């Protein structure tokens, strides 16, 4: 009964803050699927990525920059806070955020 999410996309809107007295750096991640046919359709999604931990949240806030491309592993979580807000819960050793440095 697992819950896994893997996203590769572009970072916007990095913000550090708190929630329930827990450090959190959150950002939006934009993904773009280019439809595979043999026309030319392109779906684009924005996801809320949320990094828990005093260390990890800080690491993230420091290193990760607007416009970076990254790869994220975490849990798709639904927040009732009927309305359910979907964010990705990322915190080691379960999840991680990888920066992809190009050129």
């Amino acid at each position: 009964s697992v819950n896994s999410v893997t996203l590769v996309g572009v970072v916007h809107d990095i913000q550090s803050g708190f929630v329930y007295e827990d450090a959190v750096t959150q950002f939006t991640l934009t993904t773009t699927s280019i439809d595979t046919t043999h026309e030319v359709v392109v779906e684009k999604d924005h996801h809320t990525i949320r990094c828990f931990g005093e260390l990890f949240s800080a690491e993230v806030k420091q290193k990760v920059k607007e416009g970076n491309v990254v790869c994220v592993n975490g849990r798709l979580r639904l927040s009732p806070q009927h309305f359910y807000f979907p964010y990705i819960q990322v915190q080691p050793p379960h999840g991680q955020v990888a920066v992809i440095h190009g050129d």
Partner: nanobody, 124 residues
């Protein structure tokens, strides 16, 4: 400055897989961000991978995500580099480095400690 020691190098056949280790001397490793770089013939040493202290923030050279993966075990003061689908182009000397600030980076500039390096030869 901390003393780092690569290992696991050697002669390898294309398509193969190799795992490298780096062992840190003494204390403070758990506070260290770690990184791998490599130097190929005719080229300058290049960034490969890095991992924060925590370590949920990893960092990767674009041409090498998918094939390489960095990880650490602080209960062994070791950082690893798992290599997959090896190619001739991966032939190089591979060094580990240590970042005092706990982060790691793509910049050679930003590590205080360096290993001696270990050679990986990928016979085409």
């Amino acid at each position: 400055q901390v003393q780092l020691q690569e290992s696991g190098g050697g002669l390898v056949q294309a398509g193969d897989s190799l795992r490298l280790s780096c062992v840190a001397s003494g204390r403070a490793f758990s506070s260290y961000g770690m990184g791998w770089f490599r130097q190929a013939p005719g080229k300058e040493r290049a960034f490969v991978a890095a991992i924060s202290r925590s370590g949920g923030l990893t960092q990767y050279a674009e041409s090498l995500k998918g094939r390489f993966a960095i990880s650490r075990d602080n209960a062994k003061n070791t950082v690893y580099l798992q290599m997959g689908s090896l190619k001739p182009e991966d032939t190089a000397v591979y060094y580990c480095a240590g970042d005092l600030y706990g982060l790691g980076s793509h910049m050679e500039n930003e590590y205080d400690s360096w290993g001696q390096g270990t050679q990986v030869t990928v016979s085409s």
